[PDB]
Design a binder for these strands. Structure first.
Ligand SMILES: [Mg+2]
Ligand SMILES: [Zn+2]
Lengths: 652, 1319
DNA sequence: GCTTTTGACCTCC
RNA sequence: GGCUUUUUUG
DNA sequence: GGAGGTCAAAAGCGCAAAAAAGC
């Protein structure tokens, strides 16, 4: 290939070929005159070296190097390795109809759609626009259509909106760790130059909004479009393949909103009245006539599917709060009322959502998840939950407790001065004393922070769960844990040397107050280790995944039944303490190798070749069966495949 | 007292620790290093002089001729820095060296000189460091980082038994020279000593022992203890001492003089040792069975037979005892060989020696060094000698020798650069002692074993390599001796050394492209220490130990500031107060403590010494007399941190800031932050982008002034005086009477850079910050650079932020920003791009630049002159044309705007080769530049001539000529006037002729400048002339950018929100950023909340001063308020009295404080929350720092009060328009026919292999088949795909990927036959 | 430099 | 349009 | 005489990006 100027770009192949052919010419000319054998030996040997370097460079010894002083590429060098032909241009190859952009959150989108900048959409669907313009007759030649596309005429946007009504697009984020890394969406045109994404799915991508970038690809054929819509659409991916746990769990901001919604106060404006229904209750809150959370009595109506797949109505009065009544509107018919009457932290809310998928199928559960996200964002914004410096309540006793701990070591060191204790004895004693002091300070801090006093209706102090901002953001599980709250108020705790030894003197200060110089210094020993391990674990771990894929890439289910009785027994795993995994989850969603026999002799609890699910597992729990022998993939007999029953129940 | 620059705006600071040592020159590590490389050293130990003395003199093989070094100097550089930057030439200096050629008579006694010849020799161009510690290579600025490598010397390391199954500990000893071959001593699991050289095949150690002309007896003498036996009556008695009885079992009853001393059979006891030493008995009988396990120390032969009875290192039996008894060998020498104390290590290696005569030993060494060669004895001897004792091929350096002596417990630290027999013997002995439990291994990560190599050492090393090459060449040339035919310059060829130095400076691992987009980045780039590069670890070779932080890093390298990801802990940055030692070791200041009194004496302590003393803490509370207020204080002694009495302390830290680097020290309230978040905060702060107009940070550290002044981005007054003429581009300073030189005083000129491209396409700009006619002192700040405000570092803006969730627009990490931010242009930056068009001379006609273009409409030629170059100021867009270059076929090869980029042309630069006619556009730029330069020079001319003619008029008034007659006469007529007084007339004509001198030297500098400007530019060969165009773009913040705070809370702008929808308080002022509170606790960077609270009070003081100014209240009550604000605090070190300030200064300071009082905070002596509350109380603000707010959309009061305050925000260098692109159908790669990659090339993305797995996991096969065949490379089928889409039919054709066919042919290109099969 | 694995030479029984 | 070298982000 | 022990050589060690230079 020629560059600017008279010089030409030459590859390593040309140089080696030229060298070998020139040497062949030289030897064939020298052989014609019958030179002495001493000459021909060296020429033949070094021609052998030339051909050796041609087929593979550096294998035998010193490699041929060019002006760069680095070994030249060869045929064997151009096949093997990451830069070779296979792994760079056959298993994965650059594509057209693709684009890149920066992620940005959008709350107003529904679950099954994502944003798209106008320019990206136009550039991607330019081939589609040309055809539609010809059909409507706005331009006859493709050149004319190309001319009117670049002008951004008023008709161009209309025709683009028409042609992208239900054209799904693909979204992925490198690295694509699990199969949820690529998802389909239905684009909607927006302004700006960033791609808008639905918050709920951000957990699946493991993507946060700190500059992470997305890539978009566009399907072309009808087969591709239908394949995307029926397989890779977001609404069809709510259970992870790794395990049955849901993958659309609300998190962070939404959880705090729901938590602040459903939490009673011992006294509040408009407390102790009776309301007709949830529709009326919303009228009071907006008018400011009653507090968002104050205990009242409301008439509510719930439906149950207890009949033969039919809903039956019932009505009564329940003692709940205004906020819970407001939340009750979005819950669909099937769910009971007791599911929305607690504090509704992170762990509860997901569970509640999951129950919907157990009863109401798919469309109600996705609509319900979307409504949950909307309501959570709205009532979290209206709440105005903020963190200030005064929120970090430092326990009062803490200070004096440290003094006591000091006194303790003031004695133990003396024992070393008298020689009655060794280095190990003193070390373990001070370690235990400091750990006990840490536990005491943490418990005192939590006990002081978690409760507060407020005057009730009759003018007496009453202890209620505190409304402090940090406690609300910790207890609800929205973000953080008790360890971080320990780190803010109480002592930081014992810190470790690089090798693993524990420093005898702990960091007595917390983040709210100052840290003197050496405490901050010894605190960085652990953090550097954590960062180094995090940086160097991604190289080793990802590579391992590759080795797993190439071993297991030949496995596809091909036959319904293999017809073998061989299997493996399954028992709850126990080390001598509590059960690490009960019998329920290990056997769930498999097939019985042999019929399950009752503890009563010769009774058939479970017929052979029957899938296990919730309706059969609870039968085992009531009957208290010890262990069951289930069919497994490792024993299936079909060749070049796996028995359909042997694999068990698809977790997705 | 203050200088007049900081009197403009005094920044209040907290802090209770008095300063003892102020911050040094931040760049001293770099600049002061290179000064050792070019200054003349009379001692000949540094830089060029030392390099020269180590190769010279050079003598011929016959010895009749030699060449000697005399002296050297560095010539004046041809250009200055700016001319080199514009022209693209390396700022360098020529090298002049005086060489001496001496000839000897072959027929005369040695030393008889035939002739001498002296002549300076050109040696090449040496790059020279600019004023700011940078280098200029090709119009760019490159800076050399400092390497950190293993100190030359000897180390003992233990592998902890990992490599063996049993886990037995193995010890090895290594000698690392500064230049030459290594040496390793190792122990095998079989417990034998082996030696290896240069990581080659392991060899038995004793081979080297005899290679130094040592017999076996001498070796056993050196490495073991003797036991003597005397033949008494039928007995072999021995002399015994208690000390040699350690760890032994009494095989028989130990007794002497007929009294039993020790029991028989069991182990020895200490009480028996005591009683035996009390008895003081030496000689004792021993039976025969005890001698059955001992080894004879020396050789024994018979005088009569003359045959070897028994050689050394051989076991003995009763029969050998019989021969030695009958032969008269009364004295028997054996080895002590106590396994628990003196193991038989050397003896076992002796038992596996292949040979003993040293001849086959040298042969084995020679074979091991180079396999498959004739083992010539002289060749082997020469190989060994020049391998470990040649002066040139091996050198241990001064520091290596010092470390070697210190490790081996020697005393003298001066020695030779080569080893010796005794040194190797001592190393071996210490290795044995380490094996015996005695001593302790060394630690690699200890900062005492690692040294800092600066630019000077590396430049010296490259220069020496070049000098070795050129001296080999000149020796070869001198071998062909000539009868003084040549001059001592032809034999010296400067091309090798010049090329070597140039390539090291230009293309190397450590010569990095300086990333100067704000002063902090370039300062912390000049102060970087890297463990990579030549002679160091690689990116992967490093384990988990080098990365981790060591307890000796305190005060020498910042523990919290380092790049994150693939190389962490390898690029750690130097601390603040740390400076390099003379040998090259890091050391820090400390204060001496005597008798419990802390003086102001400052001692610099290196790593090793830090392990001997007791060091107190920086913020150790102190009295007014230096006595520690408690008798118990926190201290650290040896990596530990424990309590101590007041009397055992020796040193205390100079200041609390000495632990972190500059980047970390710029972070306020660092003491309330996690390590991870502080790390990321510093790393992002390093990447800010300059703002259109800079604003001071309200809450800083207080060393912004030092950081800004130290970096060379702000013009600083060389000499104090009064400002005379001020302009947007030039500043003129008149020096005071005292500071001017005795002659040619004149004035000083500063020229300011305006909108020149940086190295990351940002704008470097300078705006004067002084008015006309005000005094300035030395060292003040006259012109603020990029991101600098009144000589104070200012990276980003300060914004009114509130922490509250807001309808999800700030869901995870995003930021919601109001429109009032973009309306005021507080974040719009300037980006400058560069485009280049070259004109070469190929075939089919050379490349010609003109306005003649075919097949182009007049729209493309409207924005072109008749010379073919766009006008300055055209609003060019994408796809337009800039430089019309054509080649006859006519080929349209003219330069075009890259697609997708707009801008405004601000500058065009044309370079022409010498001896080429310049087109009219180059003529215009040339004449305009000459006109501006002559304008400047004639301005200095006018000033200087006015001065000299004022002197002339002063002379003429005294001469007798009346002043009025002088004034009426024309300027130049004053010289021709006659003066009655002779000397006055003489003085008049003399001034008229130094008038002539001054004007003539102005004329010759005129002609020199004109010639230089007309002088053709040096270009690459084959190039006629080149042209360059600059483009200017203004970028505004739009949804998708990257903004971040200083404490690590980064994020992405979500949605620009109309001003009427933002939350507002009772006063009606909206908040223009709405952050997210949920990110505080889990991230646990609680510093940002405290900074917000402190900033909120900072504007509180600012608003009140604004209220007084509007009402124009009297200065007396205003001066009252300002003083009360400064005095607030408990035991604040800074005391400011406004009584001394005059009314004008107070008023100017007040109107300069209108936007808020700056508040400083030292890094670890920060202001507590109590004085924060106190300062908030000074205004009318709530103490809790939580006001109520009202929702913009609804007008409803938010139930819980939220936080409002002012937070410093930077806009990172990550913009969407630089990252968003998409492709439908573009170019294609030529080989594999896959689409290109990269935004600049308009290519598509990479459907990665992981994406292929994930798309396989679904049932989705058709989409994957699309990705593989139709959209990528089926060149026959992908065209049909395009035609089908336009027709409305959505269908494909599978085909077969073209990339697979290539591989087929490629496999067939070898001897492998691969082919398909039938259908 | 880590680590593994596999091949090939020495050698102890 | 291939390779080399770094730097940076995720 | 050979099966076991010990020493020597080859092959691998995330992925996406961007930015520059230089060849
Ligand atoms: Mg991220
Ligand atoms: Zn099966």
């Amino acid at each position: 290939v020629p560059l600017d100027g008279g010089r030409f770009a030459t590859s390593d192949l040309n140089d080696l070929y030229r060298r070998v052919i020139n040497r062949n010419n030289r030897l064939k000319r020298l052989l014609d005159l019958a030179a002495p054998d001493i000459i021909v030996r060296n020429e033949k040997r070094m021609l052998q070296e030339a051909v050796d370097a041609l087929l593979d460079n550096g294998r035998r010894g010193r490699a041929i190097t060019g002006s760069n002083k680095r070994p030249l590429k060869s045929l064997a060098d151009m096949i093997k390795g990451k830069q070779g032909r296979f792994r760079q241009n056959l298993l994965g190859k650059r594509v057209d109809y693709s684009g890149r952009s920066v992620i940005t959150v959008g709350p107003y989108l529904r679950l099954h759609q994502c944003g798209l900048p106008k320019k990206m959409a136009l550039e991607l669907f330019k081939p589609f626009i040309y055809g539609k313009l010809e059909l409507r007759g706005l331009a006859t030649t493709i050149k004319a259509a190309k001319k009117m596309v670049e002008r951004e005429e008023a008709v161009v946007w209309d025709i683009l909106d028409e042609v992208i009504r239900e054209h799904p697009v693909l979204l992925n984020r490198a690295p694509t760790l699990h199969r949820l890394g690529i998802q389909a969406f239905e684009p909607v045109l927006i302004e700006g130059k960033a791609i808008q994404l639905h918050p709920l799915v951000c957990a699946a991508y493991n993507a946060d909004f700190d500059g992470d970038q997305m890539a978009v690809h566009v399907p072309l054929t009808l087969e591709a479009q239908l394949e995307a819509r029926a397989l890779m659409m977001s609404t069809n991916n709510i259970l992870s393949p790794a395990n049955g746990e849901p993958i659309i769990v609300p998190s962070q901001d939404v959880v705090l909103g729901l938590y602040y919604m459903t939490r009673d106060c011992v006294n509040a404006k408009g407390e102790g009245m009776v309301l007709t229904g949830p529709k009326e209750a919303e009228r009071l809150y907006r008018s400011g006539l009653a507090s968002l959370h104050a205990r009242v009595k409301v008439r509510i109506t719930e439906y149950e599917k207890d009949a033969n797949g039919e809903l039956v109505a019932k009505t009564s009065l329940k003692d709940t709060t205004v906020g819970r009544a407001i939340l009750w509107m979005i819950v669909p018919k099937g769910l009971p009322y007791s599911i929305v009457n607690q504090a509704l932290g992170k762990k509860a809310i997901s569970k509640m959502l999951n129950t919907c998928y157990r009863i109401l199928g798919l469309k109600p559960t996705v609509i319900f998840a979307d409504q949950i996200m909307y309501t959570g964002f709205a009532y979290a914004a209206r709440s105005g939950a903020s963190v200030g410096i005064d929120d970090m309540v430092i326990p009062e006793k803490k200070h004096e407790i440290i003094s006591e701990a000091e006194a303790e070591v003031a004695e133990i060191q003396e024992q070393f001065q008298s020689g009655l204790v060794t280095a190990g004895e003193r070390y373990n004693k001070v370690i235990d004393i400091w750990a006990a002091a840490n536990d005491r300070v943490s418990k005192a801090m939590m006990d002081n922070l978690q409760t507060e006093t407020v005057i009730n209706r009759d003018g007496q102090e009453e202890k209620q769960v505190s409304f402090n901002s940090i406690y609300m953001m910790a207890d609800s599980g929205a973000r953080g844990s008790a360890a971080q709250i320990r780190q803010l108020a109480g002592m930081r705790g014992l810190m470790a040397k690089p090798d693993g030894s524990i420093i005898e003197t702990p960091i007595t200060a917390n983040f709210r107050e100052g840290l003197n110089v050496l405490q901050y210094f010894i605190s960085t020993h652990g953090a550097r280790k954590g960062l180094a391990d995090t940086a160097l674990k991604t190289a080793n771990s990802g590579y391992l995944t590759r080795r797993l894929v190439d071993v297991a890439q030949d496995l596809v289910v091909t036959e319904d039944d293999c017809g073998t009785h061989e299997g493996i027994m399954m028992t709850p795993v126990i080390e001598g303490g509590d059960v690490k995994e009960p019998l329920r989850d290990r056997v769930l969603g498999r097939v019985t190798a042999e019929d399950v026999l009752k503890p009563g002799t010769a009774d058939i609890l479970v017929p052979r070749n029957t899938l296990l699910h919730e309706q059969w597992c609870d039968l085992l729990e009531e009957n208290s069966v010890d262990a069951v022998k289930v069919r497994s993939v490792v024993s299936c007999d079909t060749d070049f495949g796996v028995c359909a029953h042997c694999y068990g129940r698809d977790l997705a | 007292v203050y200088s007049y620059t900081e009197k403009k705006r005094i920044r209040k600071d907290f802090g209770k620790r008095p300063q003892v040592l102020d911050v040094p020159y931040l760049l001293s590590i770099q600049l002061d290093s290179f000064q050792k490389f070019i200054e003349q050293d009379p001692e000949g130990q540094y830089g060029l002089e030392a390099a020269f003395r180590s190769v010279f003199p050079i003598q011929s093989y016959s010895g009749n001729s030699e060449l000697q070094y005399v002296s050297y100097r560095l010539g004046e550089p041809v250009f200055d820095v700016q001319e080199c930057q514009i022209r693209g030439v390396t700022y360098s200096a020529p090298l002049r060296v005086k060489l001496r050629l001496v000839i000897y008579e072959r027929e005369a006694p040695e030393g008889t000189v035939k002739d001498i010849k002296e002549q300076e020799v050109y040696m090449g161009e040496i790059p020279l460091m600019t004023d700011n510690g940078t280098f200029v290579i090709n119009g760019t600025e490159r800076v050399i980082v400092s390497q950190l490598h293993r100190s030359p010397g000897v180390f003992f390391d233990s592998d902890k038994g990992k490599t063996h199954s049993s886990g037995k500990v193995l010890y090895n000893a290594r000698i690392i020279p500064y230049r030459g071959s290594w040496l390793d001593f190792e122990f095998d699991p079989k417990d034998n000593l082996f030696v290896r050289i240069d990581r080659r095949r392991k060899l038995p150690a004793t081979i080297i022992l005899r290679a130094l002309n040592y017999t076996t007896e001498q070796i056993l003498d050196l490495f073991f203890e003797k036991v003597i036996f005397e033949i008494r009556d039928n007995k072999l008695q021995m002399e015994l001492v208690p000390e040699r009885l350690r760890g032994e079992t009494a095989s028989f009853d130990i007794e002497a003089n007929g009294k039993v001393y020790v029991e028989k059979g069991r182990r020895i006891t200490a009480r028996h040792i005591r009683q035996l030493e009390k008895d003081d008995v030496k000689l004792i009988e021993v039976p025969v069975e005890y001698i059955a396990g001992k080894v004879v120390a020396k050789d024994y032969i018979d005088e009569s037979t003359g045959e070897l009875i028994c050689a050394a290192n051989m076991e003995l039996s009763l029969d050998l005892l019989a021969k030695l008894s009958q032969s008269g060998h009364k004295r028997i020498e054996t080895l002590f060989t106590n396994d628990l104390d003196h193991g038989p290590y050397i003896s076992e290696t002796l038992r596996v020696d292949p040979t003993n005569d040293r001849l086959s030993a040298l042969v084995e060494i020679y074979r091991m060094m180079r396999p498959g060669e004739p083992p010539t004895r002289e060749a082997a001897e020469s190989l060994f000698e020049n391998l470990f004792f040649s002066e040139d091929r091996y050198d241990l350096s001064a520091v290596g020798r010092m470390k070697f002596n210190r490790s081996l417990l020697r005393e003298e630290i001066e020695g030779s650069g080569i080893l010796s027999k005794d040194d190797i013997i001592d190393v071996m002995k210490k290795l044995i002692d380490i094996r015996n439990g005695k001593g302790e291994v060394d630690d690699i990560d200890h900062l005492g074993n690692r040294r800092i190599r600066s630019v000077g050492e590396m430049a010296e090393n490259q220069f020496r390599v070049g000098l070795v090459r050129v001296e080999r060449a000149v020796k070869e040339r001198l071998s062909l001796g000539d009868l003084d035919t040549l001059m001592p310059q032809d034999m010296i060829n400067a091309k090798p050394i010049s090329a070597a130095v140039k390539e090291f400076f230009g293309s190397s691992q450590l010569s990095q492209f300086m990333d100067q987009n704000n002063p902090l980045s370039e300062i912390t780039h000049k102060r970087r220490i890297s463990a990579l590069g030549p002679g160091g670890l690689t990116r992967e070779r490093a384990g988990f130990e080098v990365r981790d932080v060591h307890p000796t890093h305190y005060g020498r390298v910042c523990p919290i500031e380092t790049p994150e990801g693939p190389n962490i802990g390898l690029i750690n940055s130097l601390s603040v107060y740390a400076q390099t030692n003379e040998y090259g070791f890091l050391e820090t200041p400390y204060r001496k403590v005597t008798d419990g009194v802390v003086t102001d004496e400052i001692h610099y302590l290196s790593a090793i010494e830090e392990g001997n003393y007791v060091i107190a803490q920086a913020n150790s509370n102190l009295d007014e007399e230096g006595h520690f207020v408690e008798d118990l204080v926190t201290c650290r002694s040896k990596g530990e941190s424990s309590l101590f009495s007041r009397d055992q302390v020796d040193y205390m830290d100079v200041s609390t800031q000495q632990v972190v680097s500059v980047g970390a020290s710029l972070i306020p309230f660092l003491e309330h932050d996690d390590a991870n978040r502080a790390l990321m905060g510093a790393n992002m702060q390093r990447q800010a982008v300059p703002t259109l107009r800079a604003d001071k940070p309200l809450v800083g550290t207080g060393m912004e002034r030092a950081v800004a002044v130290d970096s060379g981005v702000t013009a600083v007054a060389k000499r104090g005086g009064v400002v005379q003429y001020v302009d947007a581009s030039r500043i003129v300073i008149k020096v005071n009477e005292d500071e001017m030189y005795p002659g040619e005083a004149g004035i000083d000129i500063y020229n300011l850079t305006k909108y020149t491209r940086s190295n990351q396409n940002t704008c470097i700009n300078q705006m004067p910050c002084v008015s006309l006619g005000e005094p300035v002192e030395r060292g003040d700040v006259l012109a603020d650079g990029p991101s600098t405000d009144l000589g104070e570092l200012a990276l980003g803006q300060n914004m009114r932020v509130a922490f509250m969730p807001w309808n999800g627009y700030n869901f995870e990490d995003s930021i919601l920003v109001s429109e009032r931010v973009v309306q005021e242009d507080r974040f719009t930056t300037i980006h400058i791009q560069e485009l280049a068009c070259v004109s070469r001379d190929t075939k089919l006609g050379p490349e010609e630049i003109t306005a003649d273009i075919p097949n182009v409409g007049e729209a493309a030629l409207s924005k072109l002159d008749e010379s073919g170059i766009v006008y300055i100021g055209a609003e060019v867009t994408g796809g337009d044309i800039l430089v019309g270059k054509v080649t006859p076929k006519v080929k349209d090869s003219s330069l075009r705007v890259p697609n997708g980029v707009s801008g405004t042309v601000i500058d065009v630069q044309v370079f022409t080769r010498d001896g080429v006619e310049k087109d009219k556009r180059a003529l215009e730029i040339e004449e305009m530049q000459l006109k501006q330069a002559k304008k400047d020079l004639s301005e200095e001319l006018q000033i200087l001539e006015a001065g000299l003619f004022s002197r002339i008029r002063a002379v003429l008034v005294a001469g007798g000529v009346e002043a009025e007659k002088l004034d009426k006469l024309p300027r130049d007529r004053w010289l021709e006037l006659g003066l009655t007084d002779e000397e006055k007339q003489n003085q008049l004509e003399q001034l008229a002729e130094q008038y002539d001198e001054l004007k003539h030297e102005f004329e010759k500098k005129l002609e020199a400048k004109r010639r230089k400007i007309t002088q053709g530019d040096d270009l690459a060969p084959g190039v006629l002339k080149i042209v360059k165009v600059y483009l200017a773009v203004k970028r505004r913040i739009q949804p998708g950018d990257k903004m971040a705070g200083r404490h690590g809370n980064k994020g992405v702008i979500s949605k620009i929100n109309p001003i009427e929808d933002m939350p507002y308080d009772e006063n009606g002022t909206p908040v223009d950023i709405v952050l997210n509170p949920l990110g505080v606790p889990s991230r646990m960077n609680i510093g940002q909340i405290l900074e917000t609270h402190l900033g909120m009070a900072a504007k509180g003081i600012g608003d009140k001063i604004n209220a007084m100014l509007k009402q124009q209240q009297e200065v007396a009550k205003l001066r009252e308020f300002i003083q009360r604000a400064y005095d607030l605090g408990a035991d604040v070190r800074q005391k400011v009295d406004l009584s001394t300030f005059s009314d004008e200064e107070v008023m100017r300071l007040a109107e300069n404080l209108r936007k808020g009082m700056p508040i400083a905070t030292p890094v670890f002596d920060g202001a507590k929350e109590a004085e924060i509350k106190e300062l908030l109380k000074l205004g009318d603000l709530p103490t809790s720092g939580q006001i109520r707010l009202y929702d913009g959309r609804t007008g409803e009061q938010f139930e819980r009060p939220v936080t409002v305050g002012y937070m410093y925000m930077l806009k990172l260098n990550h913009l969407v328009d630089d990252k968003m692109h998409a492709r439908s159908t573009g170019s294609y790669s030529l080989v594999t026919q896959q689409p290109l990659g990269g935004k600049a090339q308009f290519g598509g993305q990479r459907f990665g292999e992981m994406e292929v797995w994930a798309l396989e996991a679904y049932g989705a096969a058709y989409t994957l088949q699309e990705m593989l065949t139709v959209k990528s490379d089926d060149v026959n089928g992908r065209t049909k795909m395009y035609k089908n889409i336009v027709d409305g039919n959505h269908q494909m054709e599978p085909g077969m990927p073209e990339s697979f066919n290539v591989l087929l042919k490629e496999i067939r290109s070898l001897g492998i036959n691969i082919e398909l099969e039938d259908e």
